[PDB]
């Protein structure tokens, strides 16, 4: 329990930090916890796992909420806002986890981990396909732009903000004036 979820903290504390741009070594990872390079391996079998737990967290969180946006909000159009705010809300709130989301933190690690994020971005774009696919189901008039060419565009926008959130050492916060950027997006529900 604790020992595990106390180092993942320290790891995140690095991902957010100035060093987060560099490879996160076993040596340096111990410096945060203050323990030995061996002590870590007494709680994880590998540094790879330290990054799988992180990914589960992101995968369990964003997706819980998405399955929670429908069973609380049927407004075909208000949904997206809650989704597009959920995603960009997570980022700003989680600088270090964003660096894995974008996939820069993954660079120093194994390609296996990338599939996770994609397969997440592909379950998210599928949540979106649904939201908008369901429109005609609600009021006999749906769309004109194909729903998948839409869902892509919507989430395409997001991966751009989350990238600027990173490559600006966290100065371009995704939620900022979301209210102004949004009528631009909702204008794309044609």
């Amino acid at each position: 329990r604790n020992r595990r979820e106390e180092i993942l903290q320290s790891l995140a504390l690095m991902l957010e930090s100035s060093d987060g741009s560099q490879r996160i070594t076993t040596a340096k990872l111990a410096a945060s916890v203050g323990v030995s390079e061996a002590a870590l391996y007494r709680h994880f079998p590998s540094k790879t796992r330290m990054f799988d737990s992180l990914i589960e967290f992101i995968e369990d969180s964003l997706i819980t909420r998405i399955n929670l946006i429908l069973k609380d909000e049927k407004d075909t159009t208000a949904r997206l806002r809650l989704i597009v705010l959920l995603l960009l809300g997570f980022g700003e709130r989680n600088p270090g986890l964003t660096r894995i989301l974008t996939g820069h933190a993954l660079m120093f690690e194994q390609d296996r981990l990338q599939g996770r994020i994609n397969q997440l971005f592909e379950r998210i774009e599928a949540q979106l396909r649904q939201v908008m696919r369901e429109k005609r189901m609600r009021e006999g008039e749906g769309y004109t732009t194909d729903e998948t060419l839409l869902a892509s565009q919507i989430l395409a926008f997001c991966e751009g903000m989350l990238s600027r959130f990173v490559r600006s050492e966290f100065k371009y916060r995704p939620t900022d004036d979301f209210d102004a950027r949004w009528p631009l997006i909702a204008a794309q529900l044609q």
């Binding site: 995140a12 967290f57 809300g89 997570f90 709130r93 989680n94």
Partner: peptide, 8 residues
């Protein structure tokens, strides 16, 4: 209004 914040 419930944003799961991981860190401290």
């Amino acid at each position: 209004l419930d944003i799961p914040a991981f860190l401290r």
